[PDB]
Amino acid sequence: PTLVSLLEVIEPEVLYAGYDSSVPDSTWRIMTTLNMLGGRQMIAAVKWAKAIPGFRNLHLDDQMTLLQYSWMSLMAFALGWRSYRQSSANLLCFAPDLIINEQRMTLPDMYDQCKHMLYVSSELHRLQVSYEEYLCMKTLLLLSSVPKDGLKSQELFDEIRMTYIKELGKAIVKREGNSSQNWQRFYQLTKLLDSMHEVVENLLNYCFQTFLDKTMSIEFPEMLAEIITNQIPKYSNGNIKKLLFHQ
């Protein structure tokens, strides 16, 4: 069995939001429902990461560290893919019972956050990204940041990261293009991977603010609350080494 097929088989199931369509829409209602759903997406992300070949061999501390950094990169990219497979859109397919449409985008403060998510699905569409390439890219996003001093199992991590970089390369060759275009596609796809760092930084600005401002009454589940509580001090003390393909 191929390494890419092993990443395919562990693709998490589609979760429903539990959004009652009969009651009218509001930004607060939608944002609250999405945070609660986000916690359930992140609980499934732990199960997902554990089944990625090589991940369970890293020190337990490194496993926690990687999921804590990458949480938003994983969710924005997976949503971007899900929304791109239901395109031409212009829509964010958060769950089958909760799709952010053009009318939902008009709601106060909705667009300002949605636009960073819409950039991801627009890029996968523009570059006509395949399933195999996507699977390789999502695993590479779990391994896109490390602490300032590095990981406990850094050597093993660098070995695992190189392995999945090579896996991405195999999915590019399959598109049957000449080596000049093969270099072009890799440059293009790894540029989107690098640009995820900015998408996340933009999404986390409004997310950290809604979490810290208790007067906004915007609830986060225990799983999301725990990640944000851990991440805020690390971004504050500069304890993050964002890995870049292009300099």
């Binding site: 609980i43 732990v46 199960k47 554990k50 089944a51 337990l60 926690m64 725990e226 851990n230």
Partner: peptide, 13 residues
């Protein structure tokens, strides 16, 4: 510190 995440990684799925 990060009780829920450590539990989810340590437990058998």
């Amino acid at each position: 510190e990060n009780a829920l995440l450590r539990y989810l990684l340590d437990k058998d799925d």
